Amino acid sequence: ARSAYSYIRDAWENPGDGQLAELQWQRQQEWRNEGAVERIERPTRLDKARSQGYKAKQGVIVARVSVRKGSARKRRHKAGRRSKRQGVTRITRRKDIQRVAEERASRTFPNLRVLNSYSVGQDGRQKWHEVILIDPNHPAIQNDDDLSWICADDQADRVFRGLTGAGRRNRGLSGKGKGSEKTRPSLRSNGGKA
Amino acid sequence: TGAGTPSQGKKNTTTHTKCRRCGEKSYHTKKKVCSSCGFGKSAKRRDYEWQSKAGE
Amino acid sequence: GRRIQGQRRGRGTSTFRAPSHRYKADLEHRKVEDGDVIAGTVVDIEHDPARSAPVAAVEFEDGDRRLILAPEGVGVGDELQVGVSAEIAPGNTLPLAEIPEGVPVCNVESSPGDGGKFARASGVNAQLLTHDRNVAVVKLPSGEMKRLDPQCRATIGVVAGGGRTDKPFVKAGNKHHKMKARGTKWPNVRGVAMNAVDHPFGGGGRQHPGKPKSISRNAPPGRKVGDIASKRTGRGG
Amino acid sequence: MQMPRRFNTYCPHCNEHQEHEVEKVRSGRQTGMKWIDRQRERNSGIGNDGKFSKVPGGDKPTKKTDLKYRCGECGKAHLREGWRAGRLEFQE
RNA sequence: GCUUUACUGCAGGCUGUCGCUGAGGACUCUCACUCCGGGAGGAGGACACCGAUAGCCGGGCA
RNA sequence: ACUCGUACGGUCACUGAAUCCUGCCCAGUGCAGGUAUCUGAACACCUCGUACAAGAGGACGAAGGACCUGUCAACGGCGGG
RNA sequence: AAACAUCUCAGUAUCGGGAGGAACAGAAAACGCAAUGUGAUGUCGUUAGUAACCGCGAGUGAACGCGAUACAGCCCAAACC
Numbered sequence: 016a017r018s019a020y021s022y023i024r025d026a027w028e029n030p031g032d033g034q035l036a037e038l039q040w041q042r043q044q045e046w047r048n049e050g051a052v053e054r055i056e057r058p059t060r061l062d063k064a065r066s067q068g069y070k071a072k073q074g075v076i077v078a079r080v081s082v083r084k085g086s087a088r089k090r091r092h093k094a095g096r097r098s099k100r101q102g103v104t105r106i107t108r109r110k111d112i113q114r115v116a117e118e119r120a121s122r123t124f125p126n127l128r129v130l131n132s133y134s135v136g137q138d139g140r141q142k143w144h145e146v147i148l149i150d151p152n153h154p155a156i157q158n159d160d161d162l163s164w165i166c167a168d169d170q171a172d173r174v175f176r177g178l179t180g181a182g183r184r185n186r187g188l189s190g191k192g193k194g195s196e197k198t199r200p201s202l203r204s205n206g207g208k209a
Numbered sequence: 210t211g212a213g214t215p216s217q218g219k220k221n222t223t224t225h226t227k228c229r230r231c232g233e234k235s236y237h238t239k240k241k242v243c244s245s246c247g248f249g250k251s252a253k254r255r256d257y258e259w260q261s262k263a264g265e
Numbered sequence: 266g267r268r269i270q271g272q273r274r275g276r277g278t279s280t281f282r283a284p285s286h287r288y289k290a291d292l293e294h295r296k297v298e299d300g301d302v303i304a305g306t307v308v309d310i311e312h313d314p315a316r317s318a319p320v321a322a323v324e325f326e327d328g329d330r331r332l333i334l335a336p337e338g339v340g341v342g343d344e345l346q347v348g349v350s351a352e353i354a355p356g357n358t359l360p361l362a363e364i365p366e367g368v369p370v371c372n373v374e375s376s377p378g379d380g381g382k383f384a385r386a387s388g389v390n391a392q393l394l395t396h397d398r399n400v401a402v403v404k405l406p407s408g409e410m411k412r413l414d415p416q417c418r419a420t421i422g423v424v425a426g427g428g429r430t431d432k433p434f435v436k437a438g439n440k441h442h443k444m445k446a447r448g449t450k451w452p453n454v455r456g457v458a459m460n461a462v463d464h465p466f467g468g469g470g471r472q473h474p475g476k477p478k479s480i481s482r483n484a485p486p487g488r489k490v491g492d493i494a495s496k497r498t499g500r501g502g
Numbered sequence: 503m504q505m506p507r508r509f510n511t512y513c514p515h516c517n518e519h520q521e522h523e524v525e526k527v528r529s530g531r532q533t534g535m536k537w538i539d540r541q542r543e544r545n546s547g548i549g550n551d552g553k554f555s556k557v558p559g560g561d562k563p564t565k566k567t568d569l570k571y572r573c574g575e576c577g578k579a580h581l582r583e584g585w586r587a588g589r590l591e592f593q594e
Numbered sequence: 595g596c597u598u599u600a601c602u603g604c605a606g607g608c609u610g611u612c613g614c615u616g617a618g619g620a621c622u623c624u625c626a627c628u629c630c631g632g633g634a635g636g637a638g639g640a641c642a643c644c645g646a647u648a649g650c651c652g653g654g655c656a
Numbered sequence: 657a658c659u660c661g662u663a664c665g666g667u668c669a670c671u672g673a674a675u676c677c678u679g680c681c682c683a684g685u686g687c688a689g690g691u692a693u694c695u696g697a698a699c700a701c702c703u704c705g706u707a708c709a710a711g712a713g714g715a716c717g718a719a720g721g722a723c724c725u726g727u728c729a730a731c732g733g734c735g736g737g
Numbered sequence: 738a739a740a741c742a743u744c745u746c747a748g749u750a751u752c753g754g755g756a757g758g759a760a761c762a763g764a765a766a767a768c769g770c771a772a773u774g775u776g777a778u779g780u781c782g783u784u785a786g787u788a789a790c791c792g793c794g795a796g797u798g799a800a801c802g803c804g805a806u807a808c809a810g811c812c813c814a815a816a817c818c
C-alpha cells in the first residue's frame with residue numbers, strides 16, 4: 016500500500032495547487048520575517064528529507080535558508096575591457112542558489128557537515144531551501160551504519176569543495192558518458208572548461 | 210614651500226610600529242593594522258602569490 | 266573623465282555632510298494617546314542652527330521637556346496645547362479636522378503621526394482651505410493644493426523668523442558662515458570654468474557650454490547637469 | 503536596353519533549339535533555418551558579435567543581368583552569365 | 595589624456611510584458627506586498643518594490 | 657549623503673557689486689507638452705507549416721519617432737543682393 | 738590575428754573559500770569498433786592535430802576504442818514489519 020510519505024511527495028509535485036498552495040501562502044509570511052538561516056526541529060518535506068538520508072536522531076539537524084533571487088550581483092569593470100568582458104547585467108554565477116544556500120547553512124553551524132538539501136519554494140524576491148546537517152562528533156552518529164561515513168576527516172567542510180549532491184550536479188558530474196569529458200574527475204583537472 | 214627638503218621637516222608623526230604578532234615595524238598605530246602580517250585586519254596571516262615569481 | 270562634483274556628494278564624505286553633531290533637535294509633534302490632555306509652558310526661545318530660525322523650549326504637564334517648531338508670536342510663559350481638543354490659538358497643535366477653514370498653519374504632517382513635514386521654513390505657512398470627512402485641502406507655500414488626511418496634525422500660525430530672505434548677504438563672508446551650518450559644499454565653481462575632464466561644460470578656448478544646457482530626464486548621473494528636463498527656459502514668451 | 507520576352511535558342515535540356523521565355527530572377531524567401539542562421543544565434547551575445555555585427559555593403563553603379571531562360575517545350579529553365587545593363591525592359 | 599551626430603559595445607533612465615499575484619477595455623474588493631503609527635489602528639493595494647525580458651534614449655563609461 | 661533639512665527649502669546650471677539697460681529670431685539642434693492618423697519590440701492570441709518543433713505571415717500596439725505646439729538670461733544665429 | 742571588435746593570450750596571472758597525505762572521481766537512466774559486442778573510476782601510451790569549432794581568418798581541439806597500470810564492490814529511501 017502507499018506510504019503516508021508518498022502523500023507529502025505528491026502534494027509537493029504541484030506546490031501551487033490544493034492545500035499546499037494555501038499552506039505556502041501562509042508560511043511564507045512568517046519565513047519572510049525570519050533570518051537567513053533558521054534551524055527547524057522538523058523537515059517541511061519529510062518524505063524528501065528521509066529520502067536524502069535524514070533520520071529522527073541525535074546529531075541530525077535541519078535548517079531553512081533563504082537567498083535573494085536572480086542573476087549575479089556584479090560590479091561593472093573599473094579598468095579597460097574588450098566589449099566581450101564589459102557585461103554586467105546578463106551575467107550569472109556558476110553556482111546555483113541551492114549551493115549558496117548549503118554553504119551559508121554550513122557556515123552557521125561550523126561543527127556540522129552538510130548531508131543534502133532540498134527546495135521549499137520561493138516568492139518573487141527569494142528562494143528557500145532546507146538543509147540537512149549532521150554532527151560528526153556525536154556518538155549516536157558515529158555508531159550509525161547509514162551515516163557514520165560522514166565522520167571521516169576527508170568529509171570535513173565537504174560542501175565547500177562541491178562534494179554535496181547539489182555540488183556534484185552543478186559540476187556536471189551527472190552523466191557518465193557523452194558530455195562529461197570536461198567535468199570528470201574535476202573541473203579543475205580539466206582546465207576549467209566544463 | 211617646496212615639496213622636497215622643506216616639507217620633510219614637518220615629519221614627526223609616529224605611524225608604523227613594532228607589531229605584536231609578527232615583530233616587523235609595520236603595525237600602523239593609527240589604523241591599528243599591520244601592513245606586513247595583517248594583524249588587526251585578519252586572523253589569517255597576510256599573504257599573496259604576487260610576493261614571488263609566478264612559477265615559483 | 267572624472268566624476269563630477271554632483272557625484273562626489275553622494276558618497277557622503279565629511280566635506281558634503283551637515284554638522285549634525287551640532288544640531289539641536291527634530292521639532293516633531295508630540296505623540297498623545299487621545300483626549301488632548303496635554304499642555305506645556307514655553308520655558309525659553311532658542312536659535313536653531315539647522316534652520317536659522319527660532320525654536321521654543323517647552324515643558325509639558327507630564328514632565329517632558331522638548332524643543333518645538335515655534336510659529337511667530339510665541340514667547341516665554343505662554344501656554345501651548347497639543348491634542349484634538351486643543352484651543353484654536355497660535356502655537357497650538359491639533360489634527361486638521363479640528364482646524365477651521367481659512368487658518369494659516371505650519372509644520373503640517375504628510376501622514377498622520379509622522380511629526381510634521383510641510384511648511385517648516387522661516388516665515389512660511391500652509392493655508393488650510395477645504396474641510397471634509399475624507400480629505401483636508403491645504404495650499405502649501407509653493408502654491409500647490411495638497412490633499413491630506415484630515416488626521417494629519419499641524420500647528421496654528423506661520424513659522425517664526427519671516428523676512429530672513431529680505432536682507433542681502435552683502436559679502437561672501439556672511440554666506441560663508443551660513444554655509445558652514447549646512448550640508449553643502451560652497452563656494453561654487455562654474456562648470457564652464459573647469460577642464461573638459463571634470464564636467465560636460467568644461468574645455469574650449471573661451472568659456473561656454475559647447476552644447477545645449479537643457480538635459481533629458483533620462484540622462485545618467487555624470488551627464489545630468491545644466492537645466493534638468495526644463496519645460497522651458499529664459500523669461501520671454 | 504531592350505530584350506525580347508521570347509526567342510529561339512539552345513535549350514541545354516532538350517539539347518536542341520527551342521523557343522524560350524526570359525524572366526528576371528525573383529528573390530526566393532529565406533526560411534531562417536540554414537546553418538548560418540543558427541550560427542548567428544549561437545555566436546551572438548554580450549558585446550561585439552564579430553561578423554554578426556557587420557552591416558550591409560554598398561552597391562555597384564550598374565548591376566548585371568539576372569535572368570531565367572525557360573524552354574517553351576520542356577518547361578525547364580537554365581541560367582547564363584549576365585552582362586552589365588543600366589535598365590532591362592522586355593519587348594512584348 | 596581629451597572630444598564628438600567616428601566604429602562597436604557597456605552602465606543608467608523611460609516604457610511594454612512575464613513571475614511575485616488574490617477575490618468579485620472599463621470597475622469593485624482584500625488577503626499577499628508596501629508605507630504611516632509606540633500601539634490599536636490608518637493609508638495604499640494586486641499596483642508599487644523586486645527578479646526576468648523586450649523597444650527607445652544613452653561619450654556617463656570602456 | 658543631502659537630512660535633527662521641507663519651497664523664506666536645497667538640488668542643477670548660467671551671469672558676476674551698485675547704476676542705466678538687456679532688441680529681433682523656435683528654421684536646425686536640445687528640452688518639454690500634445691497628438692486623429694502613420695510608424696513602433698517581446699509575451700499571449702490567430703492562420704499557414706511541422707502527427708510536435710524550427711519557421712513564414714497576421715492581428716493588437718507602450719515608450720519612442722513622424723506630425724503639432726511651447727521655450728533663447730537653451731545651444732546658438734542676426735548675412736549676400 | 739603583422740590594425741581590430743568575435744576569436745587569441747586563457748579559464749592563464751591574480752583574488753575568495755576548503756580538505757588530505759595525497760586530493761577529486763567511481764559501480765551505468767554508460768558505451769553505440771551497431772554487436773551473438775564491451776562492462777565502476779583515475780592515470781599512462783595511443784587513437785590525433787583526427788571529428789568538431791572558427792572575421793571558416795589567425796588560431797582552438799576532444800571522445801568511443803585499443804595497449805597498459807591498478808583492480809572491488811557495496812549502503813540507503815519505499816514496499817512488508
Ligand SMILES: [Cl-]
Nearest residue numbers: 128129173174
Ligand atoms: Cl559541510
Ligand SMILES: [Cl-]
Nearest residue numbers: 440443444447
Ligand atoms: Cl543660502
Ligand SMILES: [Cl-]
Nearest residue numbers: 526567568590
Ligand atoms: Cl535583370
Ligand SMILES: [Cl-]
Nearest residue numbers: 768774775802
Ligand atoms: Cl566496446
Ligand SMILES: [K+]
Nearest residue numbers: 096097745746
Ligand atoms: K584582447
Ligand SMILES: [Mg+2]
Nearest residue numbers: 160161812813
Ligand atoms: Mg540496514
Ligand SMILES: [Mg+2]
Nearest residue numbers: 200201204761
Ligand atoms: Mg585528478
Ligand SMILES: [Mg+2]
Nearest residue numbers: 290291292293
Ligand atoms: Mg523636527
Ligand SMILES: [Mg+2]
Nearest residue numbers: 444445446449
Ligand atoms: Mg563646511
Ligand SMILES: [Mg+2]
Nearest residue numbers: 452453454455
Ligand atoms: Mg561661481
Ligand SMILES: [Mg+2]
Nearest residue numbers: 458459460468
Ligand atoms: Mg582652466
Ligand SMILES: [Mg+2]
Nearest residue numbers: 266461464465
Ligand atoms: Mg566630459
Ligand SMILES: [Mg+2]
Nearest residue numbers: 457471472473
Ligand atoms: Mg560665457
Ligand SMILES: [Mg+2]
Nearest residue numbers: 628629630631
Ligand atoms: Mg519604515
Ligand SMILES: [Mg+2]
Nearest residue numbers: 266653655656
Ligand atoms: Mg572614449
Ligand SMILES: [Mg+2]
Nearest residue numbers: 455472671672
Ligand atoms: Mg564670466
